[PDB]
């Protein structure tokens, strides 16, 4: 069933923008990113996209496909009817560079504020020993392709620009949990997760976990356990 679909792609830059109506041919089994590529090669050569692999597994093609934060290379495009209009816009949490590309640099600025992995300062590279059950929890969080859809959808920073400097976001609190559950790490980070990275800003409404293409249980496996550990350290009258 090859048909002509109605796209409503957003065009513009940081000075203003608008949705534009395009008609593209859709074949069976194609993702949204294929339709965008066809539109680029046929109608809009200068349309801003930022894809790299087109197979999942990276995070380059993050957009909001029909109001929902998705990966363009993973959206089946048969999710939508043949008479349904598909509206592709950039991420609405980060500053817009051009049509579908945003300035995702708040994330890379947050990445270098979290203390890194610290091993014991006697262990040699070939002498590390870890059991599988000791590494499963952190291995789950290491599945994260840095798409930043979680960061985009979070309402703490999506709906409040003043909270950007106080809140690290779901991805980096998950990173803190991953480093905290590492069996060989030495740094605590529990106090700083609450005091400088704003774990308290997080109410656990869980809309992040729901956008993760990797199906990481962000709220249940990372955020709530870290809140419980912070409560151990700070909010437990048994002292």
């Amino acid at each position: 069933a090859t048909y002509d679909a109605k796209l409503r792609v957003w065009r513009g830059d940081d000075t203003g923008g608008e949705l534009h109506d395009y008609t593209v041919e859709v074949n069976d089994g194609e993702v949204v990113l294929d339709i965008i590529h066809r539109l680029q090669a046929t109608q809009t050569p200068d349309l801003a996209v930022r894809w790299n692999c087109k197979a999942g597994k990276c995070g380059s093609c993050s957009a909001e496909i029909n109001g929902r934060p998705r990966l363009m290379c993973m959206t089946r495009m048969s999710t939508f009817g043949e008479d349904e209009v598909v509206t592709v816009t950039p991420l609405r949490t980060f500053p817009v560079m051009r049509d579908l590309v945003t300035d995702v640099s708040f994330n890379y600025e947050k990445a270098r504020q979290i203390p890194s992995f610290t091993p014991p300062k006697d262990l040699q590279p070939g002498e590390y020993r870890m059991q599988q059950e000791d590494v499963n929890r952190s291995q789950e969080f290491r599945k994260c392709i840095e798409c930043f859809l979680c960061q985009n959808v979070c309402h703490v920073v999506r709906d409040h620009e003043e909270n950007k400097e106080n809140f690290a976001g779901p991805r980096f609190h998950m990173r803190i949990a991953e480093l905290d559950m590492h069996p060989l790490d030495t740094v605590d980070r529990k106090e700083m997760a609450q005091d400088e990275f704003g774990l308290g800003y997080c109410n656990i409404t869980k809309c992040c976990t729901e956008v993760c293409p990797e199906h990481i249980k962000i709220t249940d496996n990372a955020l709530i356990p870290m809140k419980e550990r912070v409560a151990d350290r700070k909010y437990d009258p048994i002292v």
Binding site: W10, G12, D14, G16, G17, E18, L19, E64, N66, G67, R68, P69, E84, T87, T89, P90, R92, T93, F94, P95, V96, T102, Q131, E133, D134, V153, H155, V156, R158, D159, H160, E161, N163, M181, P183, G198, G200, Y201, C202, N203, I204, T205, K206, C207, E210, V211, D220, I224, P225, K227, E228, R229, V230, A231, D232, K234, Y235, D236
Partner: protein
């Protein structure tokens, strides 16, 4: 404006671009919560039709029944406090703790932060709030004491288990009458909900680092995590089963046959 209408963000003058019914789940949450709260308040303050003398059936909404104004035989832990004046419920010992336990529940916080406080109403729909502090300030910072209400809920679950065990009565000793079935199912499901708690997961083995040197707590944590994956469902299920247990016991106390299996 403030969130997606900020100067540097892409110029979309629509609150959301979603085309589904994103408001459907908050409505269902609101009606369910309102129905349970209304029924529970009315039945807890009714003050009658809560005890079957023949088969020793006691509603969980009246379970710790420590007043001398209570029906004969309903006080399983003694009678402690006088007579209550029309606005103290007969189960004032446990109802505040259970209400606080479910109010500080991690799942319930999600539910009403979405539904009542509209923190996100839906996932990518912009807030009706201009400022947001989360759980950092004085009222909402108190949600971090949930583990103590979890301990209280463990104690209250033990009390309800005692009630269910003593419910196996007949005017000739042992008895089994479908009120036992309803009560026992409710108690079991309440135990499941209490043991699937996020604070239980942390306390059992969630706060450990090396699961390899703690074999017992690793097994406990694995089973508790399997239960915790379904924590959303058990909350609603236990609300329903509490309502039906109350309704059946009330019907039998007022008047209806119990459908006994060991007649008395």
């Amino acid at each position: 404006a403030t969130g997606v209408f900020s100067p540097r963000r892409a110029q979309i003058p629509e609150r959301t671009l979603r085309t589904d019914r994103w408001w459907q789940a908050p409505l269902l949450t609101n009606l369910g919560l309102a129905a349970f709260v209304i029924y529970a308040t009315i039945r807890a303050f009714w003050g009658s039709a809560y005890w079957v003398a023949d088969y020793h059936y006691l509603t969980p909404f009246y379970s710790p029944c420590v007043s001398t104004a209570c029906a004969p035989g309903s006080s399983h832990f003694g009678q402690w406090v006088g007579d209550l004046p029309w606005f103290i419920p007969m189960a004032f010992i446990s109802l505040p703790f259970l209400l606080a336990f479910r109010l500080t529940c991690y799942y319930y916080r999600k539910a009403y932060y979405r539904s009542v406080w509209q923190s996100p109403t839906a996932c990518a729909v912009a807030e009706p709030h201009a400022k947001y502090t989360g759980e950092t300030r004085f009222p909402l910072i108190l949600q971090n004491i949930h583990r103590y209400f979890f301990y209280a809920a463990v104690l209250i679950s033990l009390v309800n288990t005692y009630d269910a065990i003593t419910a196996f009565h007949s005017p000739s000793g042992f008895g089994f009458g479908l009120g036992n079935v309803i009560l026992t199912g409710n108690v079991i499901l309440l135990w499941v909900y209490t043991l699937s708690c996020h604070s239980c997961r942390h306390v059992t083995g969630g706060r450990l680092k090396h699961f390899s040197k703690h074999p017992v707590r690793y097994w406990i944590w694995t089973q508790v995590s399997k239960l915790n994956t379904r924590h959303m469902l058990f909350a609603w299920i236990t609300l329903g089963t509490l309502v039906l247990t109350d309704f059946y016991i009330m019907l039998v106390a007022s008047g209806t046959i119990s459908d006994l299996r060991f007649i008395g």
